[PDB]
Amino acid sequence: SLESFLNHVQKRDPNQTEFAQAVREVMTTLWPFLEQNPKYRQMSLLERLVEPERVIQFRVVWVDDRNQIQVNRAWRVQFSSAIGPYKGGMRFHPSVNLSILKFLGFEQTFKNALTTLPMGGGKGGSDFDPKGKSEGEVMRFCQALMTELYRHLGADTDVPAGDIGVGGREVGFMAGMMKKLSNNTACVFTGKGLSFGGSLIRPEATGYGLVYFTEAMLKRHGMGFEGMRVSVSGSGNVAQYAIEKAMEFGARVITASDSSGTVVDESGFTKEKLARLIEIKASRDGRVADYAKEFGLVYLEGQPWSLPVDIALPCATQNELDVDAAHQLIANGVKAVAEGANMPTTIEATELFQQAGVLFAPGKAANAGGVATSGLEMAQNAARLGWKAEKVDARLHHIMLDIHHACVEHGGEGEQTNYVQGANIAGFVKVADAMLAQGVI
Amino acid sequence: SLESFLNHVQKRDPNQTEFAQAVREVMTTLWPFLEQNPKYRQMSLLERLVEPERVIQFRVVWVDDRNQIQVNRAWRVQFSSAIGPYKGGMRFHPSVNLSILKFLGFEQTFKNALTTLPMGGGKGGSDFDPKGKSEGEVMRFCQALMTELYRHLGADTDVPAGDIGVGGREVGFMAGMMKKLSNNTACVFTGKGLSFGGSLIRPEATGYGLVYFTEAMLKRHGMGFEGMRVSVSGSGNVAQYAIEKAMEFGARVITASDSSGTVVDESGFTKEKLARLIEIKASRDGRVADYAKEFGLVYLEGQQPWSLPVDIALPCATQNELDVDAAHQLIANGVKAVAEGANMPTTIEATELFQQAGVLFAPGKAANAGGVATSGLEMAQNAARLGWKAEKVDARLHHIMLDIHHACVEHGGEGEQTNYVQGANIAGFVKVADAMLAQGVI
Amino acid sequence: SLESFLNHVQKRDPNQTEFAQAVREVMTTLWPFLEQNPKYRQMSLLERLVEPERVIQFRVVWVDDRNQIQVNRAWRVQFSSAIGPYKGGMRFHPSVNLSILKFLGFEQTFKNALTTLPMGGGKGGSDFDPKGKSEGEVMRFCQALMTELYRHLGADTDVPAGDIGVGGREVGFMAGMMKKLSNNTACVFTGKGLSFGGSLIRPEATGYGLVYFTEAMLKRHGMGFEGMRVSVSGSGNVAQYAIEKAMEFGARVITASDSSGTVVDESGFTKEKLARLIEIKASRDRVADYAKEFGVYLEGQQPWSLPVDIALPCATQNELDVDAAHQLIANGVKAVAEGANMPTTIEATELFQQAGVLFAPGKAANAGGVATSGLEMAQNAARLGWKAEKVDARLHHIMLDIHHACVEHGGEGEQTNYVQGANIAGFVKVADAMLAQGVI
Amino acid sequence: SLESFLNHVQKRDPNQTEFAQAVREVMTTLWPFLEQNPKYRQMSLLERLVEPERVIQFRVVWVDDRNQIQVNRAWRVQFSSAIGPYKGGMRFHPSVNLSILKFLGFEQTFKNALTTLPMGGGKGGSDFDPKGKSEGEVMRFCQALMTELYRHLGADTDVPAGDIGVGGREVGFMAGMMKKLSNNTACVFTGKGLSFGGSLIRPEATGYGLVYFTEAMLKRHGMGFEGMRVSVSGNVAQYAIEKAMEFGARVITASDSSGTVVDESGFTKEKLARLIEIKASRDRVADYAKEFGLVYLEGPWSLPIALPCATQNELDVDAAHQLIANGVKAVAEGANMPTTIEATELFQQAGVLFAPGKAANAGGVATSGLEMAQNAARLGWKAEKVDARLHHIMLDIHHACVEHGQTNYVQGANIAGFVKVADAMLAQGVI
Ligand SMILES: [Cl-]
Ligand SMILES: [Cl-]
Ligand SMILES: [Cl-]
Ligand SMILES: [Cl-]
Ligand SMILES: [Cl-]
Ligand SMILES: [Cl-]
| DSSP class per residue in C375-434 | HHHHHHHTTSPPPHHHHHHHHHHHHHHHHHHHHHTS-SSSS--HHHHHHHHHHHHHHHHH
> How many angstroms separate the CA atoms of C217 and C211, rounded?
10
B17 is in an annotated binding site: no
| Fold type of domain D1-49+408-431 | Glutamate Dehydrogenase; Chain A, domain 3 (1.10.285)
Chains D and C touch (3+ CB pairs under 8 A): no
* Cα separations in angstroms, D413 against A109, B401, C15, D22, D390: 48, 78, 61, 16, 18
Angle at D354 between CA D402 and CA D297, to 5 degrees: 155
Of A81, A383, A439, the CB nearest to B139: A439
Q: How many CB atoms lie within 10 A of CB D248?
A: 11
Q: Is B136 helix (H, G, I), strand (E, B) or coil?
A: helix
**Chain C hits for B116, Cβ within 8 Å:** 385
Compute, in angstroms, the gap from residue D137 CA to the centroid of ligand 6. 10
Residues of A with CB under 8 A from a CB of C: 139, 142-143, 155, 168-169, 172-173, 175-177, 179-180, 183-186, 193-197, 381-386
A134 Cα–ligand 1 center, Å = 12
Report in angstroms the alpha-carbon separations of A46 from A4, A26, A432, B195. Answer: 13, 11, 9, 17
C337 three-class SS? strand
As a whole number of angstroms, the distance between CA D133 and CA D137 comes to 6
SS3 state of residue C308: coil
Can you give the resolution of this entry in Å?
3.2
- Please say whether the beta carbons of B109 and B364 come within 8 A: no
Phi/psi at C68 (5° precision): -105, 115
Nearest CA in chain D to B151: D181
Identify the burial level of D52 via C-beta atoms within 10 angstroms of its C-beta, where 0-12 means exposed, 13-18 middle and 19 or more buried.
buried
| Inter-chain CB proximity C197 and B84 less than 8 Å | yes
B23-26 long-range Cβ contacts below 8 angstroms, 24+ apart: B23/B50, B23/B106, B25/B348, B26/B106, B26/B110, B26/B425, B26/B429
Q: How far apart are CA A130 and CA D37, in angstroms?
A: 34
How far off is chain D from B65, nearest CA to CA, in Å? Answer: 9
Cβ atoms of D101 and D140 within 8 Å: the answer is no
Q: Which of D102, D123, D279, D358 is catalytic?
A: D123
Neighbours of chain B (3+ CB pairs under 8 A): A, C, D
Residues of B in contact with C184 (CB under 8 A): 154, 156-157
Q: What are phi and psi of A163, to 5 degrees?
A: -165, -155
**Spatial contact of D397 and D359, defined as CB atoms under 8 Å apart:** yes
Cβ-contact A418, A411 below 8 angstroms: yes
Residue in chain A lying closest to D74 (CA): A54
Residue D302 known to bind ligand: no
**CA nearest B52: which of B110, B122, B155, B118?**
B122
Q: Decide: helix, strand or coil at residue C293.
A: helix
CATH superfamily of C1-49+417-440: Glutamate Dehydrogenase, chain A, domain 3 (1.10.285.10)
Beta pairing class for A158-159 and A86-87 = parallel
Q: Which residues of B are catalytic?
A: 123
Q: Counting beta carbons within 10 angstroms of the beta carbon of residue A82, is it exposed (0 to 12), middle (13 to 18) or buried (19 or more)?
A: buried
Candidates A174, A181, A199, A384: best to mutate against C (most CBs of C within 10 A) is A384
Q: Which of C123, C245, C334, C363 is catalytic?
A: C123
Letter for the amino acid at B75? W
Q: Please say if A123 is a catalytic residue.
A: yes
CATH superfamily entry for domain A1-49+418-441:
Glutamate Dehydrogenase, chain A, domain 3 (1.10.285.10)
Contact B197, A118 (CB under 8 A): yes
Apex C272 CA angle, C169 and C399, nearest 5: 60
**CATH number, domain D50-185:** 3.40.50.10860
How far are the Cα atoms of A165, B393, C186, C262, C268 from residue C288, in angstroms, in the given order?
70, 52, 44, 8, 17
Which ligand has the shortest distance to the CA of A74? 1
Query: Phi and psi at residue A304, in whole multiples of 5°?
Result: -80, 10
Query: C311 - beta bridge partners?
Result: C231, C336
Q: For strand C255-257 and strand B121-126, is the pairing parallel, antiparallel, or unpaired?
A: unpaired
In this chain, the answer to whether the domains covering B50-185 and B204-368 adopt an identical fold is yes
Contact C344, C323 (CB under 8 A): no
Q: What does the alpha-carbon distance between residue D425 and residue D39 come to, in Å, rounded to a whole number?
A: 12
Q: DSSP letters along A89-155, please? A: -EEE-TT--HHHHHHHHHHHHHHHHTTSSS--EEEEEES---TT--HHHHHHHHHHHHHHHTTT-BT
Q: Is D336 annotated as a binding residue?
A: no
**Peptide bond preceding A333 in cis form (omega within 30 of 0):** no
User: What residues flank ion ligand 5 with Cβ within 5 A?
Assistant: C 161-162, 191
Distance (Å, rounded) from C-alpha C320 to C-alpha C344? 5
Q: Which of B89, B84, B82, B94 is nearest to B105 (CA)?
A: B89
> What is the CATH code for C204-366?
3.40.50.720
- Residues pairing with A389 in the sheet: none
Q: Which helix (H) or strand (E) holds C311?
A: strand C310-314
Q: How far is A294 from chain B (nearest CA, A)?
A: 46
What are the residues whose beta carbon lies below 5 Å from ligand 1 (ion)?
A 128-129
Edge-to-edge order in the sheet of strand D259-262:
D253-256, D259-262, D295-297
- Angle (CA) C343-C346-C349 rounded to 5° is 75
Q: Which residues contact A418 (CB under 8 A, 6 or more apart)?
A: A354, A360, A410, A411, A412
Question: How far is it, in rounded angstroms, from Cα C172 to Cα C167?
Answer: 9
- The Cα–Cα gap between D219 and D398 comes to 11
- How many CA atoms lie within 13 Å of D25's alpha carbon, on the beta-carbon side? 15
CATH code linked to domain D204-361: 3.40.50.720
| Number of CB pairs, chain A paired with chain D, less than 8 A apart | 82
List phi, psi (to 5°) of D178. -65, -55
- Whether the upstream peptide bond of residue C56 has omega within 30° of 0, thus cis, is no
Going by C-alpha positions, the residue among D48, D103, D152 that lies closest to residue D431 is D48
CA angle C173, C106, C367 (to 5 degrees): 70
Give the DSSP H/E element, type plus range, for residue B9: helix B2-9
Q: Is A10 annotated as a binding residue?
A: no
Burial status of residue B437 (CB atoms within 10 A of its CB: 0-12, 13-18, 19 or more): buried
Please give the Cα distance from C409 to C428 (Å, whole number). Answer: 10
Ligand index nearest the alpha carbon of residue B96: 3
C157, A184: Cβ pair inside 8 Å? yes
Amino acid at C145: L
What is the Cα–Cα distance from A85 to A105, expressed in whole angstroms? 13
Rounded CA Rg of chain A = 22
Question: Which ligand lies nearest to the CA atom of residue A73 in the structure?
Answer: 1
Is D188 in contact with D175 (CB distance < 8 Å)? yes
Report in angstroms the alpha-carbon separations of A398 from A216, B120, C313.
10, 33, 47
- Cβ-based interface (< 8 Å): residues of D facing A: 12, 14-15, 43-44, 47-48, 51-59, 61-63, 68-71, 73, 97, 144, 147-148, 430-431
D21 is in an annotated binding site: no
Instruction: Collect all residues with Cβ–Cβ distance below 8 Å to D3 and sequence separation of at least 6.
Output: none
B84 and C185: CB-CB below 8 Å?
yes
Q: Taking CB atoms and an 8 Å limit, are D136 and B67 in contact across chains?
A: yes
Other Cβ atoms less than 10 A from the Cβ of C209: the count is 31
B320 torsion bin: left (phi>0), alpha (psi -120 to 50), beta (else): left
> Between the CA atoms of D198, D201, D204 and D206, what dihedral angle is there, to the nearest 10 degrees?
-70
Output phi, psi for C158, to 5 deg.
-140, 115
Collapse the DSSP code of A200 into the 3-class scheme (helix H, G, I; strand E, B; otherwise coil) and give the result: coil
Enumerate the residues of chain A whose CB falls inside 8 A of the CB of residue D53.
58-59, 148
Rg (CA), chain B: 21
- Cβ(B321)–Cβ(B233) below 8 Å: yes
Q: Please give the full DSSP string across A42-62, using - where no structure is assigned.
A: STTHHHHHHS-SEEEEEEEEE
CB contact under 8 Å between B147 and D180, yes or no, is yes
A-to-C residue pairs, Cβ atoms closer than 8 angstroms: 73
Alpha-carbon distance of C426 to C421, in angstroms, equals 9
| Helix, strand, coil percent content, chain C, rounded in steps of 5 | 50, 15, 35
Rg (Cα) of chain D, in Å, rounded? 22
Residues of D with CB under 8 A from a CB of B: 63, 67, 136, 147-148, 151, 180-181, 183
| Separation of alpha carbons D236 and D335, rounded Å | 9
CA distances from C302 to C258, C324, C325 (A): 9, 9, 12
Strands C54-63 and C69-80: antiparallel
Write out the binding residues of C for NADP(+).
206, 237
φ and ψ of A72, to 5 deg:
-130, 165
User: Do residues B243 and B256 touch, judged by C-beta distance below 8 A?
Assistant: yes
Residue type, A300: L
Q: Of the candidates D44, D51, D57, which has its C-beta nearest A55's C-beta?
A: D57
Looking at the complex, report in whole angstroms how far the Cα of residue B240 sits from the nearest Cα belonging to chain C: 28
Does D162 show up as a binding residue in the annotation? yes
Do the chains contact at B181 and D147, CB–CB below 8 Å?
yes
Contacts of B112 in chain C (CB under 8 A): none
Q: Of A123, A281, A364, A430, which one is the catalytic site residue?
A: A123
Best mutation site among B60, B145, B180 for testing chain D: the one with the most D CBs within 10 Å?
A: B180
Listed residue (B321, B424, B313) closest to B359, CA to CA: B313
- The domain segmentation of chain C, as residue ranges, is 1-49+417-440, 50-185, 204-366
- Find the distance separating the first CA and the last CA of chain D, reported in whole Å: 24
Contact between residue D269 and residue D245 where contact means Cβ atoms under 8 Å apart: yes
> For residues C291 and C277, what is the distance between their CA atoms, to the nearest angstrom?
9
Cβ distance B116 to C385 less than 8 Å, yes or no, reads yes
The full 3-state SS of chain D, as one line of letters, equals CCCHHHHHHHCCCCCCCHHHHHHHHHHHHHHHHHHHCHHHHCCCHHHHHCCCCEEEEEEEEEECCCCCEEEEEEEEEEEECCCCCEEEEEEECCCCCHHHHHHHHHHHHHHHHCCCCCCCEEEEEECCCCCCCCHHHHHHHHHHHHHHHHHHCECCCEEEEEECCECHHHHHHHHHHHHHHHCCCCCCCCCCCCCCCCCCCHHHHHHHHHHHHHHHHHHHHCCCCCCCCECCCCCCHHHHHHHHHHCCCCECEEEECCEEEECCCCCCHHHHHHHHHHHHHCCCHHHHHHHHCCEEECCCCCCCCECCCCCCCCECHHHHHHHHHHCCCEEECCCCCCECHHHHHHHHHCCCEEECHHHHCHHHHHHHHHHHHHHHCCCCCCHHHHHHHHHHHHHHHHHHHCCCCCCCHHHHHHHHHHHHHHHHHHHCCCC
Beta carbons of C172 and B376 less than 8 Å apart: no
Which partners does chain A have (≥3 C-beta pairs < 8 Å)?
B, C, D
- Which CATH number is associated with domain B204-368? 3.40.50.720
User: The domain at A204-367 falls in which architecture?
Assistant: 3-Layer(aba) Sandwich (3.40)
Inter-residue contact A152 to A54 (CB < 8 Å) = no
DSSP structural state of residue B134: -
d(CA D104, CA D110): 10
Dihedral sign for Cα atoms in the order A288, A293, A297, A300 = positive
The CA distances from residue C304 to B399, C255, C349, in Å, are 48, 9, 14
C184 CA to centre of ligand 4 in angstroms = 6
Q: Which of D67, D136, D181 lies nearest to residue B181, judging by beta carbons?
A: D181
CA dihedral (B376, B379, B383, B385) positive or negative:
positive
Residues in C lying within 8 Å of B, measured between beta carbons? 139, 142-143, 155, 168-169, 172-177, 179-180, 183-186, 193, 195-197, 380-385
Nearest to residue C339, comparing CAs of C432, C208, C217?
A: C208
Q: How far apart are CA B226 and CA B207, in angstroms?
A: 17
Q: Which amino acid, B371? A: G
CATH 1.10.285.10 given to domain B1-49+419-442: yes
B147 to D183: CB separation less than 8 angstroms, yes or no: no
Instruction: Tell me if C285 sits within 8 A of C324, measured CB to CB.
Output: no
Residues 6 or more apart in contact with residue C216 via CB below 8 angstroms: C399, C400, C403, C404
DSSP state of C233: E
